[PDB]
Coordinates of C-alpha atoms and ligand atoms in Angstrom, one line a residue:
Chain A
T669 CA 0.0 0.0 0.0
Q670 CA 1.1 3.5 -1.0
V671 CA 2.7 6.0 1.3
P672 CA 2.0 9.6 0.1
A673 CA 5.4 11.1 -0.8
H674 CA 4.3 14.7 0.0
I675 CA 1.6 15.6 2.5
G676 CA 0.2 19.2 2.8
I677 CA -1.4 20.0 6.2
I678 CA -3.7 22.9 7.0
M679 CA -3.7 22.9 10.8
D680 CA -7.1 24.1 12.2
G681 CA -9.1 24.0 15.4
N682 CA -6.4 25.1 17.9
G683 CA -8.8 27.8 19.4
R684 CA -11.8 25.5 19.7
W685 CA -9.5 22.8 21.2
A686 CA -8.2 25.2 23.8
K687 CA -11.8 26.7 24.6
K688 CA -13.1 23.1 25.3
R689 CA -10.4 23.1 28.1
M690 CA -11.3 26.7 29.3
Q691 CA -8.0 28.0 27.9
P692 CA -7.1 30.9 25.5
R693 CA -6.3 30.1 21.8
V694 CA -2.5 30.4 22.5
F695 CA -2.6 27.3 24.7
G696 CA -4.0 25.5 21.6
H697 CA -1.1 26.8 19.5
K698 CA 1.4 25.2 21.9
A699 CA -0.5 21.9 21.8
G700 CA -0.5 22.3 18.0
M701 CA 3.4 22.2 18.1
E702 CA 3.2 18.9 20.1
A703 CA 0.8 17.4 17.5
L704 CA 3.2 18.5 14.7
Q705 CA 6.2 16.9 16.4
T706 CA 4.2 13.6 16.8
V707 CA 2.9 13.6 13.2
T708 CA 6.4 14.5 11.7
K709 CA 8.3 11.7 13.6
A710 CA 5.6 9.1 12.7
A711 CA 5.4 10.2 9.0
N712 CA 9.2 10.1 8.8
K713 CA 9.2 6.4 10.1
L714 CA 6.4 5.6 7.6
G715 CA 8.4 6.8 4.6
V716 CA 6.6 10.1 3.9
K717 CA 9.2 12.3 2.1
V718 CA 7.7 15.8 2.6
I719 CA 5.3 17.5 5.0
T720 CA 4.3 21.1 4.0
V721 CA 2.5 22.8 6.9
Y722 CA 0.5 26.0 6.6
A723 CA 2.2 27.6 9.6
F724 CA 1.4 31.3 8.9
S725 CA -0.7 32.7 6.1
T726 CA -0.6 36.3 5.0
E727 CA -4.2 36.6 6.4
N728 CA -3.0 35.4 9.9
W729 CA -1.4 39.0 10.4
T730 CA -5.0 40.3 11.0
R731 CA -5.3 38.3 14.3
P732 CA -5.0 40.3 17.6
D733 CA -1.4 41.8 18.1
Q734 CA -0.8 39.8 21.4
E735 CA -1.7 36.5 19.6
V736 CA 0.5 37.3 16.5
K737 CA 3.4 38.2 18.9
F738 CA 2.9 35.0 20.9
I739 CA 2.9 32.9 17.7
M740 CA 6.1 34.5 16.2
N741 CA 7.9 33.8 19.5
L742 CA 7.0 30.0 19.5
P743 CA 10.0 28.8 17.4
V744 CA 12.3 31.2 19.3
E745 CA 11.5 30.1 22.8
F746 CA 10.7 26.4 22.2
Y747 CA 13.5 25.6 19.7
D748 CA 15.2 23.2 22.2
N749 CA 12.0 21.3 22.8
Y750 CA 11.7 20.2 19.2
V751 CA 14.6 20.9 16.8
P752 CA 17.4 18.7 18.4
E753 CA 14.9 15.8 18.4
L754 CA 13.9 16.3 14.8
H755 CA 17.6 16.5 13.9
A756 CA 18.2 13.2 15.8
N757 CA 15.4 11.7 13.7
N758 CA 17.1 12.8 10.4
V759 CA 14.3 15.3 9.6
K760 CA 15.3 18.2 7.3
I761 CA 13.7 21.5 8.2
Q762 CA 12.9 24.1 5.4
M763 CA 10.6 27.0 4.9
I764 CA 8.6 28.7 2.0
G765 CA 6.9 32.1 1.7
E766 CA 8.1 35.8 1.9
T767 CA 10.2 34.9 5.0
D768 CA 12.5 38.0 4.7
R769 CA 9.5 39.9 6.3
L770 CA 9.3 37.6 9.4
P771 CA 10.5 39.3 12.8
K772 CA 14.3 38.9 13.0
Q773 CA 14.4 36.4 16.0
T774 CA 11.7 34.2 14.3
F775 CA 13.6 34.3 11.0
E776 CA 16.9 33.4 12.9
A777 CA 15.3 30.5 14.8
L778 CA 14.0 29.0 11.5
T779 CA 17.4 29.6 9.7
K780 CA 19.3 28.0 12.6
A781 CA 17.1 24.9 12.3
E782 CA 17.6 24.9 8.5
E783 CA 21.4 25.1 8.9
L784 CA 21.5 22.4 11.6
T785 CA 19.4 19.9 9.5
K786 CA 20.5 20.8 5.9
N787 CA 22.4 17.5 5.3
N788 CA 19.5 15.4 6.7
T789 CA 18.1 12.8 4.3
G790 CA 14.8 11.9 6.0
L791 CA 11.4 13.6 5.8
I792 CA 11.5 17.3 4.9
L793 CA 9.3 19.4 7.3
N794 CA 8.5 22.4 5.2
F795 CA 7.0 25.4 7.0
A796 CA 4.8 27.7 4.8
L797 CA 5.4 31.1 6.5
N798 CA 4.1 34.6 5.4
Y799 CA 2.7 32.4 2.6
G800 CA -0.2 32.8 0.1
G801 CA -0.6 30.8 -3.1
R802 CA -1.7 33.6 -5.4
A803 CA 1.2 35.8 -4.0
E804 CA 3.7 32.9 -4.6
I805 CA 2.5 32.6 -8.3
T806 CA 2.7 36.4 -8.7
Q807 CA 6.3 36.6 -7.5
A808 CA 7.2 33.7 -9.9
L809 CA 5.5 35.3 -12.9
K810 CA 7.2 38.7 -12.0
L811 CA 10.7 37.1 -11.7
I812 CA 10.2 35.2 -15.0
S813 CA 9.2 38.4 -17.0
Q814 CA 12.2 40.2 -15.6
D815 CA 14.5 37.3 -16.7
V816 CA 12.8 37.4 -20.2
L817 CA 13.4 41.2 -20.4
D818 CA 17.1 40.7 -19.2
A819 CA 17.5 38.0 -21.9
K820 CA 18.5 35.4 -19.2
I821 CA 15.7 33.2 -20.8
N822 CA 13.6 33.7 -23.9
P823 CA 9.7 33.8 -24.2
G824 CA 9.8 30.3 -25.8
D825 CA 11.1 28.9 -22.5
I826 CA 7.8 29.9 -20.7
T827 CA 6.2 26.5 -19.7
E828 CA 4.4 25.0 -16.7
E829 CA 7.7 23.3 -15.8
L830 CA 9.6 26.7 -15.8
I831 CA 6.9 28.2 -13.6
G832 CA 7.4 25.3 -11.1
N833 CA 11.2 26.2 -10.9
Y834 CA 10.3 29.8 -9.8
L835 CA 7.7 28.9 -7.1
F836 CA 8.9 28.8 -3.4
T837 CA 8.7 25.0 -3.6
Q838 CA 11.7 25.1 -6.1
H839 CA 14.0 24.1 -3.2
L840 CA 12.2 20.7 -2.8
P841 CA 13.5 17.8 -5.0
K842 CA 11.8 18.0 -8.4
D843 CA 9.8 14.8 -7.9
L844 CA 8.5 15.9 -4.5
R845 CA 7.3 19.5 -5.2
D846 CA 3.6 18.6 -5.4
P847 CA 1.6 17.2 -2.5
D848 CA 0.0 13.8 -3.1
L849 CA -2.4 14.4 -0.2
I850 CA -3.7 17.6 1.5
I851 CA -5.2 17.3 5.0
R852 CA -7.4 19.9 6.6
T853 CA -8.5 19.4 10.2
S854 CA -11.6 20.7 12.2
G855 CA -14.2 20.0 9.4
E856 CA -13.5 23.1 7.3
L857 CA -14.4 22.2 3.7
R858 CA -12.4 24.9 2.0
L859 CA -9.4 26.0 0.2
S860 CA -7.5 28.8 1.9
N861 CA -4.9 29.7 -0.9
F862 CA -2.6 26.8 0.2
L863 CA -0.4 25.4 -2.7
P864 CA -3.0 26.1 -5.5
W865 CA -0.5 25.3 -8.3
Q866 CA 1.4 22.4 -6.6
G867 CA -1.7 20.9 -5.1
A868 CA -3.8 21.1 -8.4
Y869 CA -3.9 17.2 -8.7
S870 CA -3.8 16.4 -4.9
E871 CA -6.1 13.9 -3.1
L872 CA -7.9 15.9 -0.4
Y873 CA -8.7 14.6 3.1
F874 CA -11.0 16.4 5.6
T875 CA -11.4 15.4 9.3
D876 CA -13.6 16.9 12.1
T877 CA -10.6 16.1 14.4
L878 CA -9.1 19.4 15.9
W879 CA -5.4 19.8 15.0
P880 CA -4.0 19.3 18.6
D881 CA -5.8 15.9 18.7
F882 CA -4.3 14.9 15.3
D883 CA -1.8 12.1 16.2
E884 CA -0.2 9.0 14.7
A885 CA -3.5 7.0 14.6
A886 CA -5.2 10.0 12.8
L887 CA -2.2 10.2 10.3
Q888 CA -2.6 6.4 9.7
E889 CA -6.3 6.8 9.1
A890 CA -5.6 9.6 6.5
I891 CA -3.0 7.3 4.7
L892 CA -5.6 4.4 4.8
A893 CA -8.3 6.7 3.3
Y894 CA -5.6 7.9 0.7
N895 CA -5.0 4.2 -0.3
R896 CA -8.7 3.5 -0.9
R897 CA -8.7 6.5 -3.5
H898 CA -8.4 5.9 -7.3
Chain B
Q233 CA -29.2 33.9 -0.7
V234 CA -27.3 31.7 -3.2
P235 CA -23.6 31.4 -4.1
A236 CA -23.1 33.9 -7.1
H237 CA -20.6 31.6 -9.0
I238 CA -20.7 27.8 -8.7
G239 CA -17.9 25.6 -10.1
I240 CA -19.1 22.0 -11.0
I241 CA -16.8 19.0 -11.6
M242 CA -19.2 16.5 -13.2
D243 CA -18.3 12.9 -12.3
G244 CA -19.7 9.4 -12.2
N245 CA -21.2 9.2 -15.8
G246 CA -19.5 5.9 -16.4
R247 CA -20.6 4.3 -13.1
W248 CA -24.1 5.7 -13.6
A249 CA -24.3 4.0 -17.1
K250 CA -22.7 0.7 -15.9
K251 CA -25.5 0.4 -13.2
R252 CA -27.9 0.4 -16.1
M253 CA -25.7 -2.1 -18.2
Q254 CA -24.9 0.7 -20.7
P255 CA -21.5 2.0 -22.0
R256 CA -19.9 5.2 -20.5
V257 CA -21.2 7.3 -23.6
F258 CA -24.8 6.7 -22.5
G259 CA -23.9 8.3 -19.2
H260 CA -22.4 11.4 -21.0
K261 CA -25.7 12.0 -22.8
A262 CA -27.6 11.7 -19.5
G263 CA -25.0 14.1 -18.1
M264 CA -26.2 16.7 -20.6
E265 CA -29.8 16.3 -19.4
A266 CA -28.6 16.8 -15.8
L267 CA -26.6 19.9 -16.8
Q268 CA -29.8 21.4 -18.5
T269 CA -31.9 20.7 -15.4
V270 CA -29.2 22.2 -13.0
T271 CA -28.7 25.3 -15.3
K272 CA -32.4 26.2 -15.6
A273 CA -33.0 25.7 -11.8
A274 CA -29.8 27.7 -10.9
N275 CA -30.9 30.5 -13.2
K276 CA -34.3 30.7 -11.5
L277 CA -32.7 30.6 -8.0
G278 CA -30.5 33.7 -8.8
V279 CA -27.1 31.9 -9.4
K280 CA -25.1 34.3 -11.7
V281 CA -22.4 31.9 -13.1
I282 CA -22.0 28.1 -13.4
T283 CA -18.5 27.0 -14.6
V284 CA -18.6 23.4 -15.6
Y285 CA -15.5 21.3 -16.1
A286 CA -16.7 19.9 -19.5
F287 CA -13.3 18.7 -20.9
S288 CA -10.1 18.7 -19.0
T289 CA -6.5 18.4 -20.5
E290 CA -6.5 14.9 -18.8
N291 CA -9.6 13.8 -20.7
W292 CA -7.6 13.5 -23.9
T293 CA -6.1 10.2 -22.4
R294 CA -9.5 8.5 -22.8
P295 CA -10.0 5.9 -25.7
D296 CA -10.2 7.6 -29.1
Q297 CA -13.8 6.4 -29.8
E298 CA -15.0 8.0 -26.5
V299 CA -13.1 11.3 -27.1
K300 CA -14.7 11.4 -30.6
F301 CA -18.2 10.7 -29.2
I302 CA -17.8 13.5 -26.5
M303 CA -16.6 16.1 -29.1
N304 CA -19.7 15.3 -31.3
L305 CA -22.2 15.8 -28.4
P306 CA -22.7 19.7 -28.9
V307 CA -22.7 19.2 -32.7
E308 CA -25.4 16.5 -32.7
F309 CA -27.6 17.7 -29.8
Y310 CA -27.4 21.5 -30.2
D311 CA -31.2 21.8 -30.9
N312 CA -32.1 19.8 -27.9
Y313 CA -30.6 22.3 -25.5
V314 CA -29.3 25.6 -26.8
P315 CA -32.7 27.1 -28.0
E316 CA -34.2 26.3 -24.6
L317 CA -31.3 27.9 -22.7
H318 CA -31.6 31.0 -24.9
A319 CA -35.4 31.1 -24.2
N320 CA -34.4 31.0 -20.4
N321 CA -32.1 34.0 -20.9
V322 CA -28.9 31.9 -20.1
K323 CA -25.7 33.3 -21.6
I324 CA -23.3 30.6 -22.9
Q325 CA -19.5 31.1 -22.8
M326 CA -16.4 29.0 -22.8
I327 CA -12.9 29.0 -21.3
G328 CA -9.8 27.0 -22.3
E329 CA -7.6 26.2 -25.2
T330 CA -10.3 25.8 -27.8
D331 CA -7.9 25.5 -30.8
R332 CA -7.4 21.8 -30.1
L333 CA -11.2 21.4 -30.5
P334 CA -12.4 19.7 -33.7
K335 CA -13.8 22.3 -36.2
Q336 CA -17.5 21.2 -35.9
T337 CA -17.3 21.2 -32.0
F338 CA -15.7 24.7 -32.0
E339 CA -18.4 25.9 -34.5
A340 CA -21.3 24.5 -32.4
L341 CA -19.9 26.3 -29.3
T342 CA -19.3 29.6 -31.1
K343 CA -22.8 29.4 -32.6
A344 CA -24.4 29.0 -29.1
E345 CA -22.2 31.9 -27.8
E346 CA -23.2 34.2 -30.6
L347 CA -26.9 33.3 -30.2
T348 CA -26.9 34.0 -26.4
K349 CA -24.2 36.8 -26.1
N350 CA -26.8 39.5 -25.1
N351 CA -28.5 37.4 -22.5
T352 CA -28.6 38.8 -19.0
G353 CA -29.4 35.7 -16.9
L354 CA -27.1 33.0 -15.5
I355 CA -23.8 32.6 -17.4
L356 CA -23.2 28.9 -18.3
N357 CA -19.4 28.8 -18.7
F358 CA -17.9 25.6 -20.3
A359 CA -14.3 24.9 -19.3
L360 CA -13.2 23.1 -22.5
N361 CA -9.7 21.7 -23.2
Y362 CA -9.0 23.5 -19.8
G363 CA -6.3 23.1 -17.2
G364 CA -5.6 25.6 -14.4
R365 CA -1.8 25.4 -14.7
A366 CA -2.0 25.9 -18.5
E367 CA -4.4 28.9 -18.0
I368 CA -1.9 30.5 -15.6
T369 CA 1.0 29.7 -18.0
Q370 CA -0.8 31.3 -21.0
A371 CA -1.4 34.4 -18.8
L372 CA 2.4 34.6 -18.3
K373 CA 3.2 34.3 -22.1
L374 CA 0.8 37.2 -22.7
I375 CA 2.1 39.3 -19.7
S376 CA 5.8 38.7 -20.7
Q377 CA 5.1 39.8 -24.3
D378 CA 3.5 43.0 -23.0
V379 CA 6.5 43.6 -20.7
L380 CA 8.9 43.0 -23.6
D381 CA 6.8 45.4 -25.9
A382 CA 6.9 48.0 -22.9
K383 CA 3.0 48.1 -22.8
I384 CA 3.5 47.3 -19.1
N385 CA 6.5 47.1 -16.7
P386 CA 7.5 44.1 -14.5
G387 CA 6.5 46.3 -11.5
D388 CA 2.9 46.2 -12.8
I389 CA 2.7 42.4 -12.3
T390 CA 0.3 42.1 -9.4
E391 CA -2.5 39.5 -8.4
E392 CA -5.1 41.9 -9.8
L393 CA -3.2 42.1 -13.2
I394 CA -2.9 38.3 -13.4
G395 CA -6.7 38.0 -12.9
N396 CA -7.3 40.2 -16.0
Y397 CA -5.1 37.8 -18.1
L398 CA -6.8 34.5 -17.0
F399 CA -9.5 33.0 -19.3
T400 CA -12.1 34.1 -16.7
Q401 CA -11.3 37.8 -17.5
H402 CA -14.5 37.7 -19.7
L403 CA -16.7 37.2 -16.6
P404 CA -17.8 40.4 -14.8
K405 CA -15.0 41.3 -12.2
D406 CA -17.1 40.5 -9.1
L407 CA -18.1 37.0 -10.5
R408 CA -14.7 35.6 -11.7
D409 CA -14.1 33.5 -8.6
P410 CA -16.4 30.6 -7.7
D411 CA -18.0 30.9 -4.2
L412 CA -18.7 27.2 -4.2
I413 CA -17.1 24.3 -6.0
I414 CA -19.1 21.0 -6.3
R415 CA -17.6 17.6 -7.1
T416 CA -20.0 14.6 -7.6
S417 CA -19.5 10.8 -7.3
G418 CA -17.6 11.1 -3.9
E419 CA -14.3 11.9 -5.6
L420 CA -12.2 14.1 -3.2
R421 CA -9.9 16.1 -5.6
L422 CA -10.1 19.3 -7.6
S423 CA -8.1 18.1 -10.6
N424 CA -6.6 21.4 -11.7
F425 CA -10.0 23.2 -11.9
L426 CA -9.8 27.0 -11.4
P427 CA -6.8 26.8 -8.9
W428 CA -6.2 30.6 -9.0
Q429 CA -9.9 31.7 -9.1
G430 CA -11.1 29.0 -6.6
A431 CA -8.2 29.6 -4.1
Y432 CA -10.7 30.6 -1.3
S433 CA -13.8 28.7 -2.5
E434 CA -16.1 26.7 -0.3
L435 CA -16.0 23.0 -1.4
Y436 CA -18.9 20.6 -1.5
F437 CA -18.6 16.8 -2.2
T438 CA -21.5 14.4 -2.8
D439 CA -21.6 10.7 -3.6
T440 CA -24.5 11.4 -6.0
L441 CA -23.4 10.5 -9.6
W442 CA -23.6 13.5 -12.0
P443 CA -26.6 12.2 -14.2
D444 CA -28.6 11.9 -10.9
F445 CA -27.6 15.5 -9.8
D446 CA -30.9 17.5 -10.1
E447 CA -32.6 20.6 -8.7
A448 CA -33.1 18.9 -5.2
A449 CA -29.3 18.0 -5.2
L450 CA -28.4 21.7 -6.2
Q451 CA -30.7 22.9 -3.3
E452 CA -28.8 20.7 -0.8
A453 CA -25.5 22.1 -2.1
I454 CA -26.8 25.7 -1.7
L455 CA -28.1 24.9 1.8
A456 CA -24.7 23.4 2.8
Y457 CA -23.0 26.6 1.4
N458 CA -25.3 28.8 3.5
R459 CA -24.4 27.0 6.7
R460 CA -20.6 27.8 6.1
Ligands
LIG1453 C1 7.0 21.0 16.2 C2 8.2 21.8 15.7 O1 9.3 21.0 15.3 N1 10.2 22.0 14.8 C3 9.7 23.2 14.9 C4 10.7 24.3 14.8 C5 11.4 24.3 13.6 C6 12.3 25.4 13.4 C7 12.6 26.3 14.4 C8 12.0 26.1 15.7 C9 11.0 25.1 15.9 CL1 10.4 24.9 17.4 C10 8.4 23.1 15.4 C11 7.3 24.1 15.3 O2 6.2 23.9 15.6 N2 7.8 25.3 14.7 C12 7.0 26.5 14.5 C13 6.0 26.9 15.3 C14 5.3 28.1 15.1 C15 5.8 29.0 14.1 C16 5.1 30.3 14.0 C17 6.1 31.5 13.6 C18 4.0 30.3 13.0 C19 6.8 28.6 13.3 C20 7.5 27.4 13.5
LIG1454 C1 -26.7 21.0 -21.4 C2 -26.2 21.8 -22.5 O1 -26.9 22.9 -22.8 N1 -26.3 23.5 -23.9 C3 -25.3 22.8 -24.3 C4 -24.6 23.3 -25.5 C5 -23.8 24.5 -25.5 C6 -23.2 24.9 -26.6 C7 -23.3 24.2 -27.8 C8 -24.1 23.0 -27.8 C9 -24.7 22.6 -26.7 CL1 -25.6 21.1 -26.7 C10 -25.1 21.8 -23.4 C11 -24.0 20.8 -23.3 O2 -24.1 19.8 -22.6 N2 -22.9 21.1 -24.1 C12 -21.7 20.3 -24.2 C13 -21.7 19.0 -24.1 C14 -20.5 18.3 -24.3 C15 -19.3 18.9 -24.8 C16 -18.1 18.2 -25.0 C17 -17.2 18.7 -26.2 C18 -17.2 18.1 -23.7 C19 -19.4 20.3 -24.9 C20 -20.6 21.0 -24.6
LIG1455 C1 3.8 25.3 12.9 C2 2.9 25.2 14.1 C3 2.8 23.8 14.7 C4 2.3 26.3 14.7 C5 1.4 26.4 15.9 C6 0.0 26.7 15.5 C7 -0.2 28.1 14.8 C8 0.2 29.2 15.7 C9 -0.8 28.2 13.7 C10 -1.2 29.4 12.9 C11 -2.7 29.9 13.2 C12 -3.7 28.9 12.9 C13 -4.2 28.8 11.5 C14 -4.2 28.1 13.8 C15 -5.2 27.0 13.6 O1 -6.2 27.1 14.6 P1 -7.2 28.3 14.8 O2 -6.7 29.4 15.7 O3 -7.7 28.9 13.6 O4 -8.4 27.6 15.6 P2 -10.0 27.8 15.6 O5 -10.4 27.8 14.1 O6 -10.7 26.8 16.4 O7 -10.2 29.2 16.0
LIG1456 C1 -20.8 19.5 -20.6 C2 -21.3 18.1 -20.5 C3 -22.7 18.0 -19.9 C4 -20.6 17.1 -21.1 C5 -21.0 15.6 -21.1 C6 -20.2 14.8 -20.1 C7 -18.8 14.6 -20.5 C8 -18.5 14.0 -21.8 C9 -17.8 14.9 -19.6 C10 -16.3 14.8 -19.8 C11 -15.8 13.4 -19.2 C12 -16.0 13.3 -17.7 C13 -15.0 14.0 -16.8 C14 -17.1 12.6 -17.3 C15 -17.5 12.4 -15.9 O1 -17.8 11.0 -15.7 P1 -16.8 9.8 -15.9 O2 -16.8 9.4 -17.3 O3 -15.4 10.2 -15.4 O4 -17.3 8.7 -14.9 P2 -16.7 7.5 -14.0 O5 -15.7 8.2 -13.0 O6 -17.8 6.9 -13.3 O7 -15.9 6.7 -15.0

């Protein structure tokens, strides 16, 4: 039975999860990190090659300032709780999006994890940060037109394959750029501008399970559902 | 209160036909009847646009006899559907790379477009020889040519500009993006259908096979959309 090579994950339901426990939304975001660690280690053992997680959308900047500040600080303060273990598990950490606009300490924590794990050959945990699909496509189409104008490439070179090489996912191995499966938790049956180009042919999987409750058994059920697809 | 633009991925024509001990092509003809029913009901309900995934770039991998039968459907059955849609004030349009279409198929579609071009009701938009990635790629060949000709600058390349170069540019600006995308036969994938335009769309999946999708099934989809 097939193991999806690349899984896209839209984490949802952290606030509802926390509220059921009479806790603020930020308590749910911390439990969301625990869930991501569990899922990453299990997927790596199962043979999944890439996990792209929708960590921070360009729309997430509209959340209350205190919540945005708390979120940006998570990889800074909890780096030791997760990154050395992912490294010991041979997991390679990467990121996609307009990351040059992340707060400096957040950008540094992510770059430090990337530099530490850059030679790792196991699962690639790919954080989509300051990411939007239409914006990603726009930056690709813009960079291509500039290259055509500079005569670095000619208009005859403009193909679907060329566009793929200018998307943020260009740093993933060529055969792993596109998710085989996209998971959205908390029962939301919608697209939220996550990998619209790369995920154009992806199998979709929706669960009512809130993201902090998504564990190894929930990942196994998603893979089982994926294997019953044709 | 209805979604203004509904995207429809018609699926299950073959399984529908097989349950009746009929070849897949029998299901495609019943699929046209279902589309006529859905279009007339959606128009009466106040839906502004229906974009139907009539023929994908992947559908060319089907057996030659089936592809030939499909391409002949609007040629052979034009009188069974087009005059009635026109009497219902439905405007017919198409999106996609329609140069690969056989001449008679392209002519039947253009004849329906010319007949209904002044109609002010629901726009029935056929995505034919369509693929989302190809649509975005063609938009770049056009944009790059304009940048090279100095009609525009690379600094003018924005999300708003890209939208004006997609095939959906012919729909009114506030109707280009589907509010809801429906896929029938319990298939959980979008298959390169409006990936840019549908980036924020509500999704609706049903086990109902497309030839069985009627007004009641459309009402259930609208009801589900309203609870979102
Ligand atoms: C689980 C887990 O495993 N590795 C990370 C991580 C990876 C890189 C740097 C720091 C951390 Cl803690 C991690 C994690 O959840 N990272 C994370 C958490 C939150 C954010 C915010 C900025 C959206 C960004 C990254
Ligand atoms: C229902 C319905 O109502 N009008 C049409 C129609 C629209 C344009 C031309 C001819 C026709 Cl029959 C129509 C329909 O099913 N058209 C159709 C059917 C099949 C195809 C193939 C080429 C995928 C293309 C268009
Ligand atoms: C990478 C990682 C593990 C990050 C930690 C989680 C985090 C801060 C995610 C970004 C915000 C978000 C979309 C949360 C999902 O729940 P929600 O707040 O939308 O929940 P709700 O819909 O119940 O309100
Ligand atoms: C516009 C219109 C009404 C056109 C007629 C229908 C038609 C020819 C559609 C194109 C092929 C297709 C994707 C059919 C869906 O059922 P399927 O053949 O994939 O069924 P299956 O999954 O059960 O095999």
